[PDB]
Amino acid sequence: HIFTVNKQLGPKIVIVSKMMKDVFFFLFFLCVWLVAYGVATEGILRPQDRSLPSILRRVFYRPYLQIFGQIPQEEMDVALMIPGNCSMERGSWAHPEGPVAGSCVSQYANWLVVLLLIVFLLVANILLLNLLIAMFSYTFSKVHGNSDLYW
Amino acid sequence: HIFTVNKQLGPKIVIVSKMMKDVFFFLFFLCVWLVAYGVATEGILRPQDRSLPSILRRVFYRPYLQIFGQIPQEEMDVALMIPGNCSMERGSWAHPEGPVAGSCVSQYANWLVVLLLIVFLLVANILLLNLLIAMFSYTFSKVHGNSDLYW
Amino acid sequence: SKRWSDFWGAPVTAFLGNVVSYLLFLLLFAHVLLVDFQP
Amino acid sequence: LYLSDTWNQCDLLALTCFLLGVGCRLTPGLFDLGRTVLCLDFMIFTLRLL
Ligand code: NA
Numbered sequence: 001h002i003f004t005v006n007k008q009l010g011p012k013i014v015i016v017s018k019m020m021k022d023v024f025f026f027l028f029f030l031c032v033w034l035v036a037y038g039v040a041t042e043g044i045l046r047p048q049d050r051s052l053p054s055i056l057r058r059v060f061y062r063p064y065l066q067i068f069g070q071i072p073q074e075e076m077d078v079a080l081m082i083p084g085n086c087s088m089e090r091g092s093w094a095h096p097e098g099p100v101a102g103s104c105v106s107q108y109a110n111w112l113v114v115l116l117l118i119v120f121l122l123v124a125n126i127l128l129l130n131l132l133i134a135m136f137s138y139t140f141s142k143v144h145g146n147s148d149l150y151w
Numbered sequence: 152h153i154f155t156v157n158k159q160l161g162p163k164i165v166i167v168s169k170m171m172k173d174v175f176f177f178l179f180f181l182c183v184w185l186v187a188y189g190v191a192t193e194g195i196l197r198p199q200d201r202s203l204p205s206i207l208r209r210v211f212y213r214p215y216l217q218i219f220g221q222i223p224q225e226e227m228d229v230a231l232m233i234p235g236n237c238s239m240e241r242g243s244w245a246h247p248e249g250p251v252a253g254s255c256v257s258q259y260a261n262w263l264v265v266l267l268l269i270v271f272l273l274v275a276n277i278l279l280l281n282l283l284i285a286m287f288s289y290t291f292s293k294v295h296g297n298s299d300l301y302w
Numbered sequence: 303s304k305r306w307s308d309f310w311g312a313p314v315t316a317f318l319g320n321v322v323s324y325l326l327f328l329l330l331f332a333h334v335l336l337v338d339f340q341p
Numbered sequence: 342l343y344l345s346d347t348w349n350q351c352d353l354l355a356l357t358c359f360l361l362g363v364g365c366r367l368t369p370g371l372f373d374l375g376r377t378v379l380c381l382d383f384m385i386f387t388l389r390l391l
């Protein structure tokens with residue numbers, strides 16, 4: 001707020017607040033898709049360490065970092081895990097890496113988790129981010145003249 | 152679909168379905184280039200673990216994650232692998248890291264695999280993604296008025 | 303013997319025969335190059 | 342009239358690299374050379390689909 005007086009940094013600071021409607025749309029569509037992806041991969045492979053903050057981590061905090069290039073592969077894929085009889089329930093299991101991905105992971109239909117990872121990276125890193133650059137370019141070219149009259 | 156009634160999130164939800172032709176073009180050009188890159192690097196260096204789902208993984212699923220910043224270097228480069236006589240066939244070999252890149256990798260003409268990695272990152276990261284931002288900006292500025300009349 | 307030459311005479315089916323035969327060429331080239339290539 | 346275009350030239354290019362790949366494979370000491378030329382040739386056949 002101090003540097004709105006300046007000649008060059010003036011109008012460009014004023015414009016930023018008029019872009020916050022499109023960021024709020026992006027947070028809407030992201031939270032719908034983040035819940036949809038997250039609980040599906042959490043249900044398909046069910047870990048054994050089921051504390052409440054741990055499952056909230058591996059539902060809302062894995063995929064949010066996945067859209068910024070941080071993709072954990074060793075925590076949800078059989079071919080990168082070491083197998084073993086680490087549970088006491090019917091079925092086949094595996095042993096993930098890292099103290100947050102649970103202790104055991106079901107091996108059943110793990111190709112479907114690989115497909116949900118592909119569809120998530122498509123809709124997030126391609127549809128939404130490139131659509132968001134489209135809405136910022138349209139809004140900025142529309143409100144640039146009014147924000148210079150206001151400044 | 153429930154929140155199309157709303158005043159601010161209304162038209163921006165309606166527009167998203169009219170962008171799906173350009174995503175379908177991008178999937179077309181990506182699948183042509185993904186096959187072209189993938190089988191070439193798979194043929195140049197031939198691994199020894201040749202199950203059918205394993206070669207489908209290391210043809211279609213390495214390069215798709217390469218355009219999102221996940222680049223495996225230790226699985227296709229001699230200078231990052233440890234050499235050794237791990238095969239029983241004529242020629243020189245190496246030993247990759249990871250349970251999915253095969254057990255042995257040919258050392259012959261590995262500079263050409265480094266060049267196919269450079270040409271892939273050029274055409275995918277710069278040529279296609281920045282062209283896709285261009286087509287979303289053009290389409291959005293063209294159909295914005297009709298989608299407000301329709302909404 | 304009329305609708306046979308009606309369906310198979312159209313240019314969309316000559317094009318569709320081109321694409322199907324060309325993808326099977328690339329699949330054959332990939333099966334030769336990746337899986338069985340005896341020295 | 343054939344040489345003037347660019348995809349008659351390109352399909353010509355894919356077939357010339359195919360003949361070079363076969364003729365390099367059949368000599369006994371140049372097996373890995375043909376093994377790589379057919380890989381670059383598979384790229385040029387798949388850029389036909391565009
Ligand atoms: Na990254």
Ligand code: NA
Binds near residue numbers: 068069219220
């Ligand atoms: Na990145």
